[PDB]
Amino acid sequence: PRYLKGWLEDVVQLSLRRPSVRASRQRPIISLNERILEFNKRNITAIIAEYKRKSPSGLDVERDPIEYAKFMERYAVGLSILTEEKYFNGSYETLRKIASSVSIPILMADFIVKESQIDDAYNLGADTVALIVKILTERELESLLEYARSYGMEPLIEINDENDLDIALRIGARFIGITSRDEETLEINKENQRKLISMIPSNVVKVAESGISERNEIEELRKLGVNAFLIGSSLMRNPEKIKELIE
Numbered sequence: 559p560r561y562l563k564g565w566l567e568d569v570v571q572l573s574l575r576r577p578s579v580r581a582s583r584q585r586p587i588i589s590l591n592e593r594i595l596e597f598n599k600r601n602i603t604a605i606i607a608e609y610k611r612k613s614p615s616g617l618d619v620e621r622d623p624i625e626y627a628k629f630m631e632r633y634a635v636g637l638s639i640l641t642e643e644k645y646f647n648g649s650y651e652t653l654r655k656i657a658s659s660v661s662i663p664i665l666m667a668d669f670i671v672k673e674s675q676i677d678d679a680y681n682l683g684a685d686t687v688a689l690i691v692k693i694l695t696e697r698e699l700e701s702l703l704e705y706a707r708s709y710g711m712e713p714l715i716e717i718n719d720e721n722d723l724d725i726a727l728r729i730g731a732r733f734i735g736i737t738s739r740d741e742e743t744l745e746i747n748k749e750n751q752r753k754l755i756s757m758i759p760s761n762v763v764k765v766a767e768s769g770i771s772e773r774n775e776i777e778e779l780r781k782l783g784v785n786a787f788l789i790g791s792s793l794m795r796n797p798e799k800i801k802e803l804i805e
């Protein structure tokens with residue numbers, strides 16, 4: 559991975575030693591990006607509901623994962639399940655249980671730095687993964703992207719700055735998440751997010767991530783070309799809010 563500092567350096571070191579899982583996968587992959595495009599053609603707001611019990615920005619809740627997933631199944635275009643353990647209180651069992659309980663596409667969200675973590679996502683029933691430009695070298699990102707596609711997944715390539723965007727387009731990303739949160743510092747910058755969104759080709763499926771709580775922001779971003787919206791904290795604290803956000 560890249561050389562990092564602070565908590566990101568720690569979580570990458572932890573991820574490098576993550577024990578892999580063994581399991582026979584049951585259901586073919588169903589594509590999250592393709593379902594997003596279908597929602598766009600149907601003019602249905604496409605929200606990826608994220609399940610995470612804890613976060614570095616201070617979320618700390620207990621909520622049953624299956625009841626959350628089954629509720630979101632009716633409304634969300636997909637789910638994003640945190641599997642990182644130390645900072646997000648996620649687990650592989652959580653992903654396995656959710657994936658086996660719903661029929662909508664599932665993204666495994668973690669700090670992926672080795673191929674076995676992609677194996678883990680597949681073997682646990684996820685349909686895709688996030689890959690984070692700012693923790694990986696360009697060579698690693700190219701290699702892990704090809705590896706994920708070899709399973710039939712189209713990973714969400716996460717970007718936060720213009721360097722990240724240059725790498726993401728260079729390596730052939732077709733599904734990009736534009737996060738307004740700098741994961742190192744937790745700083746939110748929506749202006750920079752919008753600038754990056756305006757710089758992405760039309761044919762890349764774009765997901766706006768982080769700090770989203772209100773329908774009017776979703777509406778503004780959709781007008782700018784965003785195809786789907788990753789929403790975690792607001793839904794973890796009031797799940798029913800998704801109904802208003804998709805109205």
Ligand SMILES: [Mg+2]
Pocket residue numbers: 667688716735767788
């Ligand atoms: Mg994300």
